[PDB]
Amino acid sequence: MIITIPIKNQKDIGTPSDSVVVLGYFDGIHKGHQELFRVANKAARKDLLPIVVMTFNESPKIALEPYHPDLFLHILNPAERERKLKREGVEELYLLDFSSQFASLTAQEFFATYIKAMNAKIIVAGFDYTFGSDKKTAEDLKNYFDGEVIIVPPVEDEKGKISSTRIRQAILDGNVKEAGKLLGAPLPSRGMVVHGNGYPTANLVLLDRTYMPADGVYVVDVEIQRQKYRAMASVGKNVTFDEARFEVNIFDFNQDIYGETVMVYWLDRIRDMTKFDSVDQLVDQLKADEEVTRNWS
Amino acid sequence: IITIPIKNQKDIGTPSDSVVVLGYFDGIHKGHQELFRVANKAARKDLLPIVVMTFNESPKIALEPYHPDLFLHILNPAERERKLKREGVEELYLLDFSSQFASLTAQEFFATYIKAMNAKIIVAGFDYTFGSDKKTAEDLKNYFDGEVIIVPPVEDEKGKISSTRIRQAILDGNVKEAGKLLGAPLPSRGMVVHGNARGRTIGYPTANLVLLDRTYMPADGVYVVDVEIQRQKYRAMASVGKNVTFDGEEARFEVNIFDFNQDIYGETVMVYWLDRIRDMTKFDSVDQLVDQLKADEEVTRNWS
Ligand SMILES: [Cl-]
């Protein structure tokens, strides 16, 4: 269906036939990106051109900027990224490390190199698009490409343009529902059940360098063995972790699932983490939480 | 290409009869090599494909109190494939060693995964223990109609060749010894990053590496290594340091690449550990530090 293809350089690219290429960094494959793909699928209709894409293993900042661990954080894991681009209609996905050499390529070297190797017959790119050490715009595209160039207008909501930067921030703020509206699907995190510490809890360790929602209590869906269960997720600092760990209370589920990988889909935030003055207060909150979670939709 | 991840046995797709080798395969060390060797000498009698099933993470995780060390491997998955593929593996299955998988009895396992696998014959280690029941190497014939082959432990002068001996050697710093047992030098996958550039300032430019995987790092020290960048190998010197801070352990991975003058920020590089030059130290002076770097560079250039 889709081939992801790790490449050291353009020489590695193997596309057989003319294609339409979509240009961008593609973290999270949000509504904005999807619009690029909707337009690309419309352009690949006349000649049945397949759609191909190249993007990067890691943020370009790693090559450009002082090192910081957060520079390794992704909205989506690689498998989820591929899954979402597959749904967009992409047929070849080339993955390249953004490097000093790649970064020094001017707009012209870039076409002479990656575009050619890709056989672009039609190029789709966003209004905000920026490329080459030359730092050219989306308009300058026409000047570098023999073939057709389509520039898609920015996708905006009441708040503004839909961007990865907004998604990171919404997640960090704990606004999972907003992140999910922007993403176009609820954020998926991949975790593993582990042996760690009323209502019983699964202890999850996040397996990817993906953003963790803010501390709080969330309504989530959890996928185990291809079956989705509703659950409450709790994230706290010095409470559920101290490495990203968090906890889940899976409703209507009792089984031993240690060492099992699960998918968490973040649906909504309920409340902040809170210290409780009494046990009774705590239980009351949990009962209320449970009700809110089982009934959310 | 070779690796397909599965939730369960239903996911397995072997088209035809095949040879299935069993064990937990970390590092694809030589004793593993013999098992494949024995299996290959059997897969010849009917020309059948070797297919193999191992786990994403230590079985220790479904079984014991959690600890991050449990997520540590000798090899990252891409390298694990290489050794296996080279070793003539055709289909690799990766499954999570869940509580549910733990509960399978030895019959039950044969009924599901072996059935799915299509094994005409099974090749196994003398040590190997499977199943909830604990049925051992010898209990295998009863379960399997087909030929059961029990390769005898591939010993070395030190003794039995194991992942525990490899894990131990790496942690001790003795990477030569680990390369020996592995049958190849340990590969570590790093990414060049904008770290501490005191090296470039001094005129002895270095690349700061962040390890990309949950794999064992060698004992702190300075090492001769080869580095692969853009498919080209270069002799290099590597410095490894692990300094505690409140927030946690800060790990420094430094590589000095001989006869290399390009900017590689962002590039993934592979580090192959050949031997250990010396202990890590602290230099009070540019003179002290430089004399020591020349002496290390001579050792590194001259190493084989
Ligand atoms: Cl990681």
Coordinates of N, CA and C and ligand atoms in Angstrom, one line a residue, chain A residues 206-209, chain B residues 212-214, ligand 1:
Chain A
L206 N 5.7 5.0 28.2 CA 5.6 5.5 26.9 C 6.8 5.0 26.2
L207 N 6.7 4.4 25.0 CA 7.8 3.8 24.2 C 8.4 4.6 23.2
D208 N 7.9 5.9 23.0 CA 8.4 6.7 21.9 C 8.8 8.1 22.4
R209 N 9.6 8.8 21.7 CA 9.9 10.1 22.0 C 8.8 11.0 21.4
Chain B
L212 N 20.8 6.8 19.7 CA 19.4 6.9 19.2 C 18.5 5.8 19.7
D213 N 19.1 4.8 20.5 CA 18.5 3.6 20.8 C 18.7 3.2 22.2
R214 N 17.8 2.4 22.8 CA 18.0 1.8 24.1 C 18.9 0.5 24.1
Ligands
CL1 CL 13.5 6.2 23.1

